[PDB]
Amino acid sequence: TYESLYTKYRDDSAILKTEDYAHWTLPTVYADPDLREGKRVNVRRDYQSVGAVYVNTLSAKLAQVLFPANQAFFRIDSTGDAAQLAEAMGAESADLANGLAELENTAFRRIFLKSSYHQLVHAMKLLIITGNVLLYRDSNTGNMHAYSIRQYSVLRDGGGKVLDMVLKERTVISELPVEARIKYRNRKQDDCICLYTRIKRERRAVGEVFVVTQQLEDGLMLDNLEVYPEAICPFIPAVWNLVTGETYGRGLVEDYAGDLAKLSALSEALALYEIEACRVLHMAKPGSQIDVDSMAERESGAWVAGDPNGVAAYEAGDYNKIIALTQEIQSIAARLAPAFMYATAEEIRQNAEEAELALGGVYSVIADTLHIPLAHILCWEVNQQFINELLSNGLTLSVLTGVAALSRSTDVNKLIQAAQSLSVILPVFQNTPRVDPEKILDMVLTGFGINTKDLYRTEEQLQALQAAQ
Amino acid sequence: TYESLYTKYRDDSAILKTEDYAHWTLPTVYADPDLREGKRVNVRRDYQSVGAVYVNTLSAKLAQVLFPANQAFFRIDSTGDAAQLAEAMGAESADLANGLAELENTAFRRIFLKSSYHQLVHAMKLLIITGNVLLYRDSNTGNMHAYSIRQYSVLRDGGGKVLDMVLKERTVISELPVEARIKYRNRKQDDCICLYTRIKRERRAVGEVFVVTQQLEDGLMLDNLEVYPEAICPFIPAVWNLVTGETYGRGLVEDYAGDLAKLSALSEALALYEIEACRVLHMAKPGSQIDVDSMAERESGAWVAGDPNGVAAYEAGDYNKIIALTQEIQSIAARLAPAFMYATAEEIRQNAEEAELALGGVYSVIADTLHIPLAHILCWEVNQQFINELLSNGLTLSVLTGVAALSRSTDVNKLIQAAQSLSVILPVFQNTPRVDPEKILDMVLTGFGINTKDLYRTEEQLQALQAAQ
């Protein structure tokens, strides 16, 4: 009876309010799937297209910053406890730094298989306009899909923890498993049948757990029970702005509804004036001597008798109004521009920082709510054994995010500077025997923020080098 | 009776609505083939030509970005499972990297044989204007063809999976096989006869399958049964924008119909004024002393008696209206410009990124829906055995797309930078024996994102080099 839960957990007020926001920017992203059965039903548009362009540009731009195509978007600290991390893979105490880097480098490419990038862009659009999205990642094939709030509903506490979810989907009988298709032997046409999925949180001895099950419209279960640890669950609900106490988030467009509402009416008035500007009439002045028939029926080049100014073109003075309205609309549009950001790894650094400045602190929220689970899922896909050992014991991987994934990104810059300075300081002091070069080295290296333990040689290596002479 | 299915699967509303979009941009691309039998039937044009220029420019530009002429448009990851991939070709563990690169480099040239590029451009036009296209690739010869929704119809579930298709085509009796031409012995003229093809999805033990069959108008089958795995099917339906629940997609032009509709009327009014500006009349003022006969019939150079201002040229004041209308039309046209993008491998990178920014996230959709099957088809054409082994077992090739085919494109840039930095850091630290050069190497290389396993020498090679002394 998952239909009962699905209906119970909905919020009609938010669904009804979020129609205008879509109507002002991109109506086709928020279309109701329950009013159509495979045929077009018309969708109306608005008198202005500024919102569409702004939203398209911002959604396209956000994808490049969050998911760069030539470097990983997450880093592993590993400073917590190297013992267990090294014991899981079975490597030396120092080879962990190389192994983690190899895993991170080889893992992030998996996000570009089987059209995931397009779904990511669609999810960004959904988050910007409606502020809610559910993301499903299939490990067997490598494909993803994004859903709107018209196909799912969630339940959470006052503290924000998600407790339950239900998802609706439509299909046909031919797609069902052989076990369940023995029933419904009649009516084996391409008739549509609904399917429901439920995700529920539960706790076992070694931690919390998510349980997945499925059911048809008429109560019948379909087995397929699966259990995942909370860290590697394939379902990811996300929010843009979440007011404490509520269940669903809010979008960026909701903060700027007044300007769009004030712009649509001006656009309508401009359209009315432009349509009025298409009257082509010629007026014959009354009280003037003219020969209308000859003027209107003679071939070009003839001579006629009458005043050379007895006929004039219709004039209403509506051009100045168009000129005036255009300037006001342009001024409002320009004033709205900054809010929507309309205009080597360091380039990505600066772009992300400027996105932080423009958005106001949501880039960090998006990074926090998306980067953490995807990293675990991809790492599990690339190496099952290593993650299985970590989850069974209870401890979990540490990941850095929030414009802070520069752990292995821009350390070479801090080494180049040290090398440049060491080439200027050491040539001097070579003659003076009172200054120890080792202390200068140990001061300069630590000054720039480099852990000397990853560069200095061990005692055994020095002894071997001295012996090899 | 494939005619019944063909008629059943059509959507008349979309077909009737999509006429205006073609009429505003390029009427000849959407002409009905069932109203003509080999003779011209006139096609009407519109008062404005902005849409035609914009569509031509965008369609021409899109082809260069998607299908560059001097590098492959797809890359193979191979990180999934090198065991089976190496076992299929019969190569070593490390020679796979070279073999895959060779295959990718030698495969992509096949797209330029026998006039495929023109069909690709036509398909891009069709996608932009109507948002639907069916693409057929013939392996025997190397030619392609593109069809509009006036010649085919498709069926899909609520989830978007395509289940069935039907295609219509016209020909003559002389083209039929000898087996079927024994019938229809009479009427062996060049009379036109229709032909129908059906593509249906079905599942067998080792995966899903597509079945192709043909039939004439009068029920008679023509044999030619063929079976393809779903991955290497030669038919590819595509969409530009697909609203969940519906069957056919939507085009880019549909988002900007209001501006074009508002522009056509202004163009008509401008044409009316321009036609009015062709009245050449001379008016003889009433109440003035003049000698009209002498003025109008004497040779040039004569002297006449009369006022020097008794005759004036006709004046209606319609020039200012032309000046005004031109500015408004130009302003609207300029405002429409950005939406249609009107204005070394890195150049292609930047061009594709800017296309991503302008379009709003469709470049990725087009790449996802076109690159994946064409890669498999071309690879099968260049090497049948390798693909046959992979498909029989069940596993499939992994391909990267969505402005993410840079796997083997721009790795040399990340190596040049490392080489430049290594030439500045290693000259220093040569005197200090406390810093190990190997650790600096292993840090700098991994910092830029290079898998050291493809550069470092193995233990055996080092031993051999040491012995060779």
Author numbering:
A (entry chain B), B (entry chain A): 7 to 349, 359 to 484
Passage from the reporting paper:
Podophages that infect gram-negative bacteria, such as Pectobacterium pathogen ΦM1, encode tail assemblies too short to extend across the complex gram-negative cell wall. To overcome this, podophages encode a large protein complex (ejectosome) packaged inside the viral capsid and correspondingly ejected during infection to form a transient channel that spans the periplasmic space. Here, we report a near-complete atomic model of the bacteriophage ΦM1.
An adaptor assembly (gp52) interfaces with the portal and six tail fibers (trimeric gp47), each of which appears composed of long helical bundles much like phage T7, as well as adapts trimers of spike protein (gp39) which may be homologous to those in phage P22, another podophage, and 9NA, a siphovirus. The EP3 octamer adapts the locally 8-fold symmetric interface of the ejectosome to the 12-fold symmetric crown of the portal by intercalating the EP3 helix α-2 between the crown domains of adjacent portal monomers, forming contacts with the C-terminal portal helix. EP3 intercalates in a pattern in which two EP3 α-2 helices intercalate in the gaps between two adjacent portals, followed by an unoccupied gap. This results in four unoccupied portal crown domain gaps, and eight filled with the α-2 helices of the EP3 octamer. The C12 portal complex that sits in the locally C5 MCP environment results in a symmetrically incompatible interface that is best characterized by C1 symmetry. In our 3D classifications, we also identified two populations of particles in which ejectosome structures were aligned, but portal density was also rotated by ∼6° about the Z axis. This suggests that the ΦM1 portal may also exist as two discrete particle populations. Reconstruction of capsid dimers to low resolution reveals a probable interface forming between opposite and opposed adaptor proteins. Inspection of the dimer interface between symmetrized adaptor models auto-fit into the map suggested that this oligomerization likely forms due to formation of a putative reciprocal salt bridge network, forming between residues Arg25 and Asp23 of each chain of gp52. This hypothesis is tentative given the poor map resolution.
